[PDB]
Each structure stands twice: as C-alpha cells, then as structure tokens.
Write a protein that holds these residues in place. Structure first.
Motif, mmCIF file in Angstrom:
data_model
loop_
_atom_site.group_PDB
_atom_site.id
_atom_site.type_symbol
_atom_site.label_atom_id
_atom_site.label_comp_id
_atom_site.label_asym_id
_atom_site.label_seq_id
_atom_site.Cartn_x
_atom_site.Cartn_y
_atom_site.Cartn_z
ATOM 1 N N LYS A 76 11.012 5.725 4.323
ATOM 2 C CA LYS A 76 11.533 6.526 5.425
ATOM 3 C C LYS A 76 12.522 5.738 6.274
ATOM 4 O O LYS A 76 13.389 6.329 6.926
ATOM 5 C CB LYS A 76 10.385 7.054 6.282
ATOM 6 N N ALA A 77 12.401 4.410 6.292
ATOM 7 C CA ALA A 77 13.395 3.583 6.965
ATOM 8 C C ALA A 77 14.599 3.308 6.075
ATOM 9 O O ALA A 77 15.561 2.674 6.520
ATOM 10 C CB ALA A 77 12.767 2.270 7.422
ATOM 11 N N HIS A 78 14.553 3.752 4.818
ATOM 12 C CA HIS A 78 15.588 3.478 3.822
ATOM 13 C C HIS A 78 15.746 1.988 3.559
ATOM 14 O O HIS A 78 16.829 1.524 3.204
ATOM 15 C CB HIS A 78 16.930 4.106 4.208
ATOM 16 N N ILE A 79 14.669 1.237 3.734
ATOM 17 C CA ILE A 79 14.615 -0.160 3.324
ATOM 18 C C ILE A 79 14.305 -0.223 1.837
ATOM 19 O O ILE A 79 13.493 0.554 1.324
ATOM 20 C CB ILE A 79 13.564 -0.919 4.153
ATOM 21 N N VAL B 149 0.875 3.684 2.105
ATOM 22 C CA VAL B 149 1.349 3.919 3.463
ATOM 23 C C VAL B 149 2.535 3.016 3.769
ATOM 24 O O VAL B 149 3.541 3.446 4.349
ATOM 25 C CB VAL B 149 0.201 3.712 4.465
ATOM 26 N N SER B 150 2.435 1.750 3.373
ATOM 27 C CA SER B 150 3.564 0.843 3.513
ATOM 28 C C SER B 150 4.775 1.360 2.757
ATOM 29 O O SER B 150 5.905 1.276 3.248
ATOM 30 C CB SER B 150 3.180 -0.544 3.010
ATOM 31 N N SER C 255 0.831 -1.189 0.000
ATOM 32 C CA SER C 255 0.000 0.000 0.000
ATOM 33 C C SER C 255 0.875 1.253 0.000
ATOM 34 O O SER C 255 2.061 1.189 0.328
ATOM 35 C CB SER C 255 -0.914 0.001 1.220
ATOM 36 N N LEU D 54 6.367 4.334 4.601
ATOM 37 C CA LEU D 54 7.044 3.848 5.798
ATOM 38 C C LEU D 54 8.345 3.138 5.449
ATOM 39 O O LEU D 54 9.369 3.341 6.109
ATOM 40 C CB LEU D 54 6.131 2.919 6.591
ATOM 41 N N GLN D 55 8.324 2.294 4.417
ATOM 42 C CA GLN D 55 9.530 1.573 4.030
ATOM 43 C C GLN D 55 10.616 2.530 3.566
ATOM 44 O O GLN D 55 11.784 2.390 3.943
ATOM 45 C CB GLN D 55 9.210 0.563 2.934
#
Lengths: 49, 49, 49, 49
Positions: free
Chosen positions: B46-49, B39-40, B37, B43-44
């Motif tokens: 912003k974690a630099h994943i 949002v996912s 999604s 979030l991913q």
C-alpha cells in the motif's frame, strides 16, 4: 523514522500496534543484545536464566 | 550456536562485514529488518515500497 | 512539573510526548495504545476539541 | 475544559478514525482504485461529505 511506516501504521489488529507487524525494530519480542532494564511488556516472552 | 532459531541470520553479518561506515549503511541495516508477515506485505504494498 | 498543565488543543500543538511527560493519565493512555504516539495529527483530541 | 482534559484520557478507550483522515493515506494512483472505500463521499471539489 525510516523503520516504521508512519503514513499507514495508525491502528491495531491485536494488542500490538500495526508498526510492530511491519518491522522487527518495533516488535517487542526482539531484544537488544545488551540489556540493563527488563522491558515493560513481555506478553509472549519468557526469559530463562 | 542456534542460527536457525535466531532472528538475524548469516546475511546480516555478511553485509555488515564490508559495508562502508556511513549513515546509509545504518539505514539499510534497519531496512533489512522489515518483517515478511502478510500484514507487513499488505502495508508495504500500500506504500508502493 | 507540579504547576504545569498540558493542553492538547490543536492538530499542530498536541505533541503526545510532552503531554505524557506532564500528565500521568495521558502517559497511561499512550502506554495502552502505542500507535497513538505518532505526530501526524492522529493523536485523539478530547471530544470538546 | 482545561481541567477536564485529563479526565478524557482517564478512560483507556480508543476513538474511531474520521473519514477525512482515512483519505490521506492513499497514494496518488490507488486513490482511484476500487479499494478506496471513501470514494462514495468525494462528490464535490469544494465541499466535504
């Protein structure tokens, strides 16, 4: 611990927590293949027998 | 037999059929469950994943 | 359990799991807001603390 | 305070997240980007605002 993103999942954007949006393990709509007790919350979920 | 409406499709079992029986295989199975999604995705990133 | 009172008073000692086990009000609070279950100091302390 | 602790959680309202806590979830490189809202408070190395 690996499944969620503990560093960034502090919040909500609906009744659900942010952790539910990022990974399916924390999403309550995904059921385990074997069940012994029904889940506490079933907002959008309907079970048919 | 409703594969398309299921959550876990063919690649999951294809992976599990040959993965070594080590902790890291469990970790990878968990990592494959990340949702896609928007949002996912934010979030991913912003974690630099 | 009957004689025990939980006291979350410090960001190092506020474990929501223990408090929810010892107190029903905290259990309901955490049930309502699952994202507060984390252990990074994001669990809301009482206004006094 | 100890007796009043349950009364705080008795009301199921979430609390605002403090600005200092919000700073902690930026990674080292995007702390300096324009997306870091909190930058307007980071004025002095030795003091908080």
């Amino acid at each position: 611990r690996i499944s969620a993103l503990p560093g960034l999942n502090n919040g909500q954007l609906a009744e659900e927590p942010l952790s539910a949006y990022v990974n399916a393990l924390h999403d309550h709509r995904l059921w385990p293949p074997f069940v012994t007790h029904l889940p506490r919350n079933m907002e959008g979920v309907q079970v048919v027998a | 037999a409703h594969e398309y409406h299921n959550w876990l499709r063919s690649p999951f079992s294809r992976y599990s059929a040959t993965c070594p029986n080590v902790l890291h295989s469990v970790m990878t199975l968990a990592a494959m469950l990340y949702k896609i999604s928007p949002v996912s995705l934010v979030l991913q990133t912003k974690a630099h994943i | 359990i009957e004689y025990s009172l939980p006291v979350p008073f410090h960001r190092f000692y506020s474990n929501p799991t223990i408090c929810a086990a010892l107190s029903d009000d905290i259990k309901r609070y955490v049930t309502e807001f699952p994202h507060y279950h984390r252990h990074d100091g994001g669990f809301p302390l009482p206004t006094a603390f | 305070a100890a007796r009043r602790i349950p009364h705080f959680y008795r009301v199921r309202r979430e609390v605002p997240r403090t600005v200092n806590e919000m700073k902690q979830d930026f990674v080292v490189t995007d702390f300096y980007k324009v997306g870091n809202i909190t930058l307007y408070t980071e004025l002095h190395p030795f003091f908080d605002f």
